[PDB]
Design a protein around this ligand. Structure first.
Ligand SMILES: CCC#CCOc1cc(COc2ccc(C(F)(F)F)cc2)ccc1Sc1ccc(OCC(=O)O)c2c1CCCC2
Ligand SMILES: C=C(c1ccc(C(=O)O)cc1)c1cc2c(cc1C)C(C)(C)CCC2(C)C
Lengths: 210, 265, 12, 11
């Protein structure tokens, strides 16, 4: 459109040993991918820089939770990590971290499963989740905004064209976003706890603050 | 057709909103901008002002001033939890949901509703308190000693953004209803009948925003997005409540608010 | 539990 | 890992 669900499918269709430490490991490995994916999103490689940065620091993690959760739509009571591993929820309920895990399954994965979310919305979600102008510091405020509005517009268009027998779908995509919010939060809350206290294979990139 | 049904529900919910909530955005804004006949709000900007305006205002008021402000707040919330229950009830379908679900949706839902609607009483400089009679500057609130000086500033920051969507009470009444029928509250027993109701709400909300705000493109999506921050402010609000409990006394906590807080995380 | 909520929820 | 994201971006 003015932001196209396909120049956007690209970014998606382009950047394709105890359970305790294995996960954050895999997300380190994801961090460079998430470098790559936000590269090819329309009008994006314009204006500023530090804030094309500040943005991927702001929710590297919600982007990254959606990637693997969607990816675990074909798995039962567990996830497929970046590396390919499989933290089935019993390894995560033993590893202390079972609860924030339960929510990932039933609140994201299962809800993505149930409605059958597809891959182009995944990247319009993660592209509004990215175009978050409530991040501190910007040349223009309506930068990450008027362009995030473009995503709304196109995302809405795609949904109606692709799924005409579901007029309620656009709002669901957007309503999958909060429960991710609260799950980005306490995912984060967790990482800090496994962090400047000790004991876990922390990786160089994950580290890049937290 | 179905459109007329959507307009009907939009009016039902507005009438009901008007009935359940003594102080509307329409009135709040008329006071804030002094477009009214009643004398202006009495302005609390400092401890001296706090003292004189104290008297004419909406138990154990032998507490320091931050705690009496905090408990003034919380008691207004209790009344608000009740106004909102009565409104939830007016939503078609609501009272037919498993009652354990009506409880849950309210448990998790009222704080999101409270701070949404309180935006309508704020400007970037203060909130209006006691059915419009007084006006607590944001500054005086930042100056209250930790953790009380922290309660409201995240509210004002959200509201200043929220208020920029320029929603009126007609729009607020469906959005609020949309918030209550959230299928993603923890421990819901029957998710589908709640979503079936919210989907129809959403439809009604979208036609309202386009009828009511034709020039305002993507208002619906932007408004739904705010359900994103909100999901947040609430969380930094529940913690802040724990920090009051960890660090503050024997303070009375209303039973009703106990029930909402009990095990909500 | 949550009797006070059930209470408001069921008053007419 | 420490700054380094302006070429990791702007090559
Ligand atoms: C630290 C926490 C705080 C604060 C600042 O905000 C408030 C404060 C109070 C209590 O006010 C005082 C002030 C002075 C003194 C004393 F010193 F004189 F005793 C004691 C208490 C009450 C309400 C608010 S905000 C508010 C305003 C209107 C609302 O509804 C509409 C309406 O009522 O018209 C609602 C709310 C909040 C949620 C429920 C609905
Ligand atoms: C954001 C996470 C993440 C991101 C991407 C992947 C991936 O493999 O693609 C895996 C995990 C993540 C997820 C989790 C964690 C920590 C992190 C960093 C902790 C909280 C450590 C364990 C629980 C879960 C599995 C939810």
């Amino acid at each position: 459109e003015d932001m196209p669900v396909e120049r956007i499918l690209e970014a998606e269709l382009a950047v394709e040993n105890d359970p305790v430490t294995n996960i954050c490991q895999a997300a380190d490995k994801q961090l460079f991918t998430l470098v790559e994916w936000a590269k090819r999103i329309p009008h994006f490689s314009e204006l500023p820089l530090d804030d094309q940065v500040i943005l991927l620091r702001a929710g590297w993690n919600e982007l990254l939770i959606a990637s693997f959760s969607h990816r675990s739509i074909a798995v039962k009571d567990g996830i497929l990590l970046a590396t390919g591993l499989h933290v089935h929820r019993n390894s995560a309920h033993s590893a202390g971290v079972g609860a924030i895990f339960d929510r990932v399954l039933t609140e994201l994965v299962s809800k993505m499963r149930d409605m059958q979310m597809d891959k182009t919305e995944l990247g319009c979600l993660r592209a509004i989740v990215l175009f978050n102008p409530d991040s501190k510091g910007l040349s223009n405020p309506a930068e990450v905004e008027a362009l995030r509005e473009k995503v709304y517009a196109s995302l809405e268009a795609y949904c109606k064209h692709k799924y005409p027998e579901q007029p309620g779908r656009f709002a669901k995509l957007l309503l999958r976003l909060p429960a991710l919010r609260s799950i980005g939060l306490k995912c984060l809350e967790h990482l800090f706890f496994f962090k400047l206290i000790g004991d876990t294979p922390i990786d160089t990139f994950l580290m890049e603050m937290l | 057709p179905e459109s007329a049904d959507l307009r009907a529900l939009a009016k039902h919910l507005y009438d009901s909103y008007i009935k359940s909530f003594p102080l509307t955005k329409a009135k709040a804004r008329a006071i804030l901008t002094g477009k009214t006949t009643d004398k202006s709000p009495f302005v609390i900007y400092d401890m001296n002002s706090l003292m004189m305006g104290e008297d004419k205002i909406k138990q154990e008021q032998s507490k320091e001033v931050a705690i009496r402000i905090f408990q003034g707040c919380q008691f207004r919330s209790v009344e608000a939890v009740q106004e909102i229950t009565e409104y939830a009830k007016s939503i078609p379908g609501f009272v037919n949901l498993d009652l354990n679900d009506q409880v849950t949706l309210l448990k998790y839902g009222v704080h999101e509703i409270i701070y949404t609607m309180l935006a309508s009483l704020m400007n970037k400089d203060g909130v209006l308190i006691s059915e419009g009679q007084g006006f607590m500057t944001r500054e005086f609130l930042k100056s209250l000693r930790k953790p009380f000086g922290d309660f409201m500033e995240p509210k004002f920051e959200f509201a200043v953004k929220f208020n920029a969507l320029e929603l009126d009470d007609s729009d607020l009444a469906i959005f609020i209803a949309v918030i209550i029928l959230s299928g993603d509250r923890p421990g819901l027993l029957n998710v589908k009948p709640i979503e079936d109701i919210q989907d129809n709400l959403l439809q009604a909300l979208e036609l309202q925003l386009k009828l009511n705000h034709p020039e305002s493109s993507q208002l619906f999506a932007k408004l739904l997005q705010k359900m994103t921050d909100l999901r947040q402010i609430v969380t930094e609000h529940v913690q802040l409540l724990q920090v009051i409990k960890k660090t503050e006394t024997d303070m009375s906590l209303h039973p009703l608010l106990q029930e909402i807080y009990k095990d909500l995380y | 539990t949550s009797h006070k909520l059930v209470q408001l929820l069921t008053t007419t």
